[PDB]
Amino acid sequence: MTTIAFLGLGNMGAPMSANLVGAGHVVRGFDPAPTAASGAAAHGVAVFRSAPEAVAEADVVITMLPTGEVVRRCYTDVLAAARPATLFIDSSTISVTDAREVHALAESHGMLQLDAPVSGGVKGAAAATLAFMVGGDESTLRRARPVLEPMAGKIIHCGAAGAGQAAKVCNNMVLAVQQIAIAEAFVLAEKLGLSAQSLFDVITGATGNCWAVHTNCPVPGPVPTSPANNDFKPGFSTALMNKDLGLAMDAVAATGATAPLGSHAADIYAKFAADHADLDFSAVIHTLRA
Amino acid sequence: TTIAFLGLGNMGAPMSANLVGAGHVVRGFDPAPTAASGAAAHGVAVFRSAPEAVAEADVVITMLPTGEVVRRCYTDVLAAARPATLFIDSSTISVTDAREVHALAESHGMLQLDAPVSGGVKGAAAATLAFMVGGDESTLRRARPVLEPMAGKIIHCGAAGAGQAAKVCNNMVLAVQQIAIAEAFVLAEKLGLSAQSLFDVITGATGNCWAVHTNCPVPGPVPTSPANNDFKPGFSTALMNKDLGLAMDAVAATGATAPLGSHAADIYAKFAADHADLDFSAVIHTLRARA
Ligand SMILES: NC(=O)c1ccc[n+]([C@@H]2O[C@H](COP(=O)([O-])OP(=O)(O)OC[C@H]3O[C@@H](n4cnc5c(N)ncnc54)[C@H](O)[C@@H]3O)[C@@H](O)[C@H]2O)c1
Ligand SMILES: NC(=O)c1ccc[n+]([C@@H]2O[C@H](COP(=O)([O-])OP(=O)(O)OC[C@H]3O[C@@H](n4cnc5c(N)ncnc54)[C@H](O)[C@@H]3O)[C@@H](O)[C@H]2O)c1
Ligand SMILES: C[C@@H](CCC(=O)O)C(=O)O
Ligand SMILES: C[C@@H](CCC(=O)O)C(=O)O
Numbered sequence A: 001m002t003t004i005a006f007l008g009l010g011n012m013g014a015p016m017s018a019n020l021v022g023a024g025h026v027v028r029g030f031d032p033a034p035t036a037a038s039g040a041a042a043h044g045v046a047v048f049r050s051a052p053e054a055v056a057e058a059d060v061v062i063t064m065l066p067t068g069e070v071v072r073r074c075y076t077d078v079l080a081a082a083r084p085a086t087l088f089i090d091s092s093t094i095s096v097t098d099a100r101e102v103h104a105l106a107e108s109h110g111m112l113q114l115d116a117p118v119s120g121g122v123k124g125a126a127a128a129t130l131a132f133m134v135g136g137d138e139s140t141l142r143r144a145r146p147v148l149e150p151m152a153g154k155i156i157h158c159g160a161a162g163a164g165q166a167a168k169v170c171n172n173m174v175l176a177v178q179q180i181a182i183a184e185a186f187v188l189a190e191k192l193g194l195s196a197q198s199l200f201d202v203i204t205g206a207t208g209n210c211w212a213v214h215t216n217c218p219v220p221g222p223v224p225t226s227p228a229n230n231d232f233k234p235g236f237s238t239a240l241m242n243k244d245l246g247l248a249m250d251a252v253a254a255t256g257a258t259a260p261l262g263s264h265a266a267d268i269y270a271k272f273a274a275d276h277a278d279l280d281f282s283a284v285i286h287t288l289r290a
Numbered sequence B: 001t002t003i004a005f006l007g008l009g010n011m012g013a014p015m016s017a018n019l020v021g022a023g024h025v026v027r028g029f030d031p032a033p034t035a036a037s038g039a040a041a042h043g044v045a046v047f048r049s050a051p052e053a054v055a056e057a058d059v060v061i062t063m064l065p066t067g068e069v070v071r072r073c074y075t076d077v078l079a080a081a082r083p084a085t086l087f088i089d090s091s092t093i094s095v096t097d098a099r100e101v102h103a104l105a106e107s108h109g110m111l112q113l114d115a116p117v118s119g120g121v122k123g124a125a126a127a128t129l130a131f132m133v134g135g136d137e138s139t140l141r142r143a144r145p146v147l148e149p150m151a152g153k154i155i156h157c158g159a160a161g162a163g164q165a166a167k168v169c170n171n172m173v174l175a176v177q178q179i180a181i182a183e184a185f186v187l188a189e190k191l192g193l194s195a196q197s198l199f200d201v202i203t204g205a206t207g208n209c210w211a212v213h214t215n216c217p218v219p220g221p222v223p224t225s226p227a228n229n230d231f232k233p234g235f236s237t238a239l240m241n242k243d244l245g246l247a248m249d250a251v252a253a254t255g256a257t258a259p260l261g262s263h264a265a266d267i268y269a270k271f272a273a274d275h276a277d278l279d280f281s282a283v284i285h286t287l288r289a290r291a
């Protein structure tokens, strides 16, 4: 049982923090959105007036923030307030470049730091079944594990600082490509007169199977739990996929990589996000009909 | 059952040998002597013409290179077959050509299925092919005992042409996935994320698919994948290019929108100009031709 400062108490940070409180940690919260902070307080987070004050007597500091810029500014504001050798865990989704920069910044201030972005969304966060993809030192992850556990269904060490962000962004790029491809297949099948149930049964029993079909089937019927059956309510929103793909495109640009389908998927989701940000990312199927 | 087997090539030769092995009388035709000889050496009675092979057959199987050849073969044998002969086309051809040759065969009083396959020569020899079948349920029931000794899986996809459609749709997705996995491994490498690390994450996460868990395009994480064996097929780029050509036919015939599948088709057509004999996973090494 350690004292944890938790900066960012929003859609993800609120249920994350609640699980920490439930596990017996003292959680010192800050969020400049008083609605967020109030909700967190209701579940036992001690809310502070400023981030520096929340971090001042914390063994661990978790950030769950919107962007790399917001992480960078938060770190600049709070690192000097924290006790030397405090463990910073950033569970935001941010660029590999930004993660590496904030890691170095934390370390130059005498703090341990990991990137530990997650997958599972709000449902995963509430149920404590998130996946944490961690970058940093193995020994620092060893020190973090007892804090991550009450939030996690899986903790995977991906490599050195930034590798957690990297693994997540690579997976998500692939996921976006698969979701569009699966959508293209279902619409082609429809036009060829092949039934959606029939195509589902084939692909899921064959080499094309993947989560985008078996779990996120973009036509109503074959997977009654998929968003297609609930008006494309997220699920994993187009807004969030578009964010993650922007981060993938930042990684492609920073490395000089060639990612033709991943970049094409990014273009497709950027356009689709202009008007359908609020729909599950499987809703992209709409653009292929009508 | 007496079976006429027209097309005794890379796939047709092992298929027909499994039919002989299961107790069928197999009558054969192939215009390549080396194919026909190889087939006769495993018990196929080879004839000098396709209509001759078909004459005493209860079932006619075609395993031929294209829809145009299948079409010609049908018009070249239909009058020679007995009424209510069961025609099964296991070639990989367009949905349009499949439906046309089905209607041709039925108008001669034959029963006809499209039954294209997945699994390659190794699957053919091992009798583990997956047949994706279009046509009437009752006709598939009649065919089942003939297909079984060639097959690990038999799936009824719908009415005539549905087998071809199902296979073309699955394979278009597969092509997109194999390129997407390659892009991810190269990106990971440039970001300093080890291949084993990316493999461990993606195979435990939403991005998982056969293209990575079995066909992983970098050596190490899946020691049997083609990447560890100089990209020996496996599933050749030549064949993947062929299937995506058929997918682009279907897209053009229907006016469908398939941007990533069409992009993958473009990528594999260009890769096939240089490396048609390599497993399709070798596409990982041609991405900088796209830069
Ligand atoms: N929502 C999801 O489904 C999901 C899933 C996986 C990962 N993520 C990632 O998790 C991160 C957070 O997502 P979210 O959905 O909780 O976003 P959110 O916008 O709901 O919450 C972020 C919170 O951070 C607060 N904040 C901003 N600046 C701050 C600062 N300096 N100190 C403290 N708090 C500050 C905001 O007021 C807001 O309440 C993002 O990087 C997102 O990409 C989200
Ligand atoms: N090779 C594979 O791994 C594989 C896997 C799945 C599907 N397929 C499909 O199977 C079909 C055949 O493939 P293959 O690899 O056996 O090709 P192949 O070229 O080796 O065999 C085709 C044979 O048909 C013969 N032929 C041509 N016209 C004929 C006719 N009128 N009558 C009889 N025979 C004739 C040719 O001489 C040749 O031997 C293709 O449609 C292909 O897409 C191939
Ligand atoms: C996918 C995973 C579940 C744990 C988690 O939710 O991250 C598992 O199989 O253990
Ligand atoms: C993810 C964590 C499990 C803790 C939990 O189930 O909440 C672990 O043991 O790695």
Ligand SMILES: C[C@@H](CCC(=O)O)C(=O)O
Pocket: B127, B147, B148, B149, B150, B151, B152, B153, B154
């Ligand atoms: C295709 C059939 C197996 C028949 C066989 O291969 O012997 C089945 O799996 O039902």
